Design a protein around this ligand. Structure first.
Ligand SMILES: *[C@@H]1O[C@H](CO)[C@@H](O)[C@H](O)[C@H]1NC(C)=O
Ligand SMILES: [Cl-]
Ligand SMILES: [Cu+2]
Ligand SMILES: [Cu+2]
Ligand SMILES: [Mg+2]
Ligand SMILES: [Mg+2]
Ligand SMILES: [O]
Ligand SMILES: [O]
Lengths: 325, 325
């Protein structure tokens, strides 16, 4: 039951038709009858993570199904990580599979998919599993709205079809010349998977340290930026400018993409100044934060909570900067 | 412009000429710094300034509102009955390059009393092109030889974004390459026209040194100087007949309209000497030899390209221009 074949099959089934109740009777039975609190010896933490999540569920404090999910939303992330924490404590596959089946039917689908992916990646139980490409598990997040609408039409008419995607914007938009870079479905999987492998929410109490993570954070994004500029150079364009909090964002964007639940992704006009975002930050807060990071760089040390100096004039300095940035 | 032909300068002012001064003085608009007039305030220098072309496109769009107000030409407006353009081809490759040109700076320096001149020259790199010949095959089924006006334009096929332009979107971008009057005999015949003979262009000016030598040689020895071999200085330089294009080559539409030379030159003398620069510089001391509106037949809106395609005496073909760096 812990064989790679069965674990892979289990994961395939859990991720199938993710917006609907599971169509697999064996997963249905588990979701109905399994008790995450029913055997604390299943877990390396004596059952604590399961208690934490079940209390949120039983108190009706979890995000509803059929709702957008953003990893950058603090509360939604906290909920996804409560399920990750349970999966991460399972000693044996049946604990992992049964909790995943149980919470698939109780939790928001975006949170569930996120937690299951990082759970597989960061548990030794996940070794050998190949995660399906997210562009087939949640295609809305990788497919423009026009093609999704054709897929909806194919389903409404019960007729199979294959539909061509053809990049956002018009030829009048010079930025479209390089749309094949950032819209490539594999480039997007690269990016999501890097962050799943090296999550900003990681704590070593989850089981292990992620070596040089802050420096790898700098490097992977430096390479994304440098690779994009090489596409611009290939297409008779100048390099990208850098963002400034007090200057206009020249290039707007119309995603022409939609959530499965939540509506169309919002458009940004050309040539707009940053505005304060209610519930997030003031633009001035971003400037102050930037200033404080540059203060550390130019001091050669990061300032600890009690004021003492943390030396960054050494090879680990770039990593510590990644940690704080 | 305005000119002294304006019927009401008190009311309409002098938009274009005042604009030259407004633009030219923007480096010192209040005279605080005592700077001299800008390059826009001399016809010798105005085109050096990039804003010259922004100003003149602005002015061009004023004229275009007027030319766009007239009804599009019809088939009957445009047809030269019994005259068909069967083929348009070029003998010789269309190739541009840069070469070197020298002129004397002696008049710029100060000569003393009893101080021998020394030769002081400037050498400039200038665009140029290879000679070529139009081959325009025409079928005259009128029943007798007829005077025809040959109107030759170069038109863009696509814009800088790679978007294919409609004829209406091309016409105002087309550049005049030639206009000439020629008797077309009954039957099918190929008209040949050298690039060197364009009525849009004139050759490079003879140098001051060459003019002095020829005048002095003629005066010394009682030799009738005759320079009837040179042209006026008004006209696009022959060397700039073609746009630079790209080393990879670019394709353009070569547009040829063959129109009724009798109608076009009525009230003048069609088969007479009109000099070498009548297209834009007219004929010294004579009426302008072509009765058609300047830009004919491209100067009115063409909302329906079928009208032009149905006219046998109009034809365009694709040509390629290559720059040799
Ligand atoms: C979609 O693309 C394929 C191959 O590129 C082509 O054969 C097919 O005709 C395209 N369909 C449409 C509607 O353009
Ligand atoms: Cl012939
Ligand atoms: Cu990232
Ligand atoms: Cu002017
Ligand atoms: Mg459900
Ligand atoms: Mg902040
Ligand atoms: O001008
Ligand atoms: O001008």
């Amino acid at each position: 039951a812990s064989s790679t074949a069965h674990k892979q099959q289990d994961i395939n089934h859990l991720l199938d038709k993710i917006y609907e109740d599971t169509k697999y009777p064996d997963l249905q039975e588990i979701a109905k009858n399994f008790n995450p609190l029913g055997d604390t010896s299943m877990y390396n933490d004596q059952g604590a993570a399961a208690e934490v999540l079940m209390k949120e569920l039983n108190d009706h404090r979890l995000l509803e199904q059929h709702h957008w999910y953003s990893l950058f939303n603090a509360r939604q992330r906290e909920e996804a990580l409560m399920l990750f924490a349970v999966l991460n404590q399972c000693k044996v596959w049946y604990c992992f599979r049964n909790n995943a089946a149980y919470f698939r039917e109780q939790m928001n689908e975006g949170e569930f998919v996120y937690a299951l992916y990082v759970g597989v990646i960061h548990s030794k139980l996940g070794d050998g599993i190949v995660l399906p490409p997210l562009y087939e598990i949640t295609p809305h997040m990788f497919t423009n709205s026009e093609v999704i609408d054709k897929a909806y039409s194919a389903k409404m008419t019960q007729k199979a079809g294959t539909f061509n995607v053809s990049f956002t914007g018009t030829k009048k938009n010079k930025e479209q010349r390089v749309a094949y870079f950032g819209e490539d479905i594999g480039m997007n999987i690269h990016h999501v998977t890097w962050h799943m492998d090296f999550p900003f929410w990681w704590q070593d109490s989850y089981g292990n340290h992620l070596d040089r993570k802050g420096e790898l954070f700098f490097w992977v994004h430096h390479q994304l930026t440098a690779r994009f500029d090489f596409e611009r150079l290939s297409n008779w364009l100048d390099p990208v400018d850098e963002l400034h909090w007090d200057r206009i964002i020249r290039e707007g964007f119309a995603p022409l993409t939609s959530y499965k639940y939540g509506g169309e992704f919002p458009v940004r006009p050309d040539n707009i100044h940053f505005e304060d975002v209610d519930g997030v930050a003031h633009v001035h807060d971003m400037e102050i934060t930037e200033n404080r990071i540059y203060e550390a760089i130019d001091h050669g040390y990061i300032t600890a909570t009690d004021g003492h100096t943390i030396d960054i004039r050494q090879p680990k300095g770039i990593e510590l900067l990644g940690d704080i940035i | 412009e305005s000119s002294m032909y304006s019927p009401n300068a008190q009311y309409y002012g002098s938009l274009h000429n005042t604009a030259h001064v407004m633009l030219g003085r923007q480096g010192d608009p209040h005279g605080k710094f005592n700077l001299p007039p800008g390059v826009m305030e001399h016809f010798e220098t105005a085109t050096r300034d990039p804003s010259f072309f922004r100003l003149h496109k602005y002015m061009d769009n004023i004229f275009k509102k007027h030319t766009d107000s007239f009804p599009p030409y019809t088939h009957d407006d445009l047809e030269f009955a019994g005259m068909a353009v069967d083929g348009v081809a070029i003998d010789g490759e269309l190739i541009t390059f840069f070469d070197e040109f020298q002129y004397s700076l002696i008049n710029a320096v100060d000569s003393g009393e009893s101080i021998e001149d020394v030769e002081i020259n400037a050498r400039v790199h200038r665009l140029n092109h290879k000679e070529f010949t139009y081959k325009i095959t025409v079928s005259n089924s009128i029943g007798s030889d007829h005077l025809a006006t040959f109107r030759i334009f170069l038109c863009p096929i696509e814009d800088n974004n790679g978007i294919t332009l409609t004829l209406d979107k091309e016409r105002w971008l087309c550049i005049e390459l030639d206009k000439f009057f020629q008797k077309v005999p009954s039957g099918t015949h190929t008209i040949h026209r050298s690039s060197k003979d364009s009525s849009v262009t004139v050759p490079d000016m003879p140098s001051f040194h060459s003019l002095k030598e020829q005048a002095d040689n003629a005066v010394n020895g009682g030799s009738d100087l005759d320079l009837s071999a040179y042209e006026r200085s008004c006209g696009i330089p022959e060397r700039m007949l073609l746009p630079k294009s790209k080393p990879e080559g670019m394709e353009f539409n070569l547009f040829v309209a063959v129109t009724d030379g009798d109608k076009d030159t009525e009230g003048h003398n069609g088969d007479h000497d009109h000099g070498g620069t009548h297209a834009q510089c007219g004929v010294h001391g004579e009426a302008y030899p072509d009765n058609r509106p300047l830009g004919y037949p491209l100067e009115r809106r063409i909302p329906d390209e079928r009208v032009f395609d149905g006219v046998p005496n109009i034809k365009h073909v694709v040509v390629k221009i290559v720059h040799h760096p």
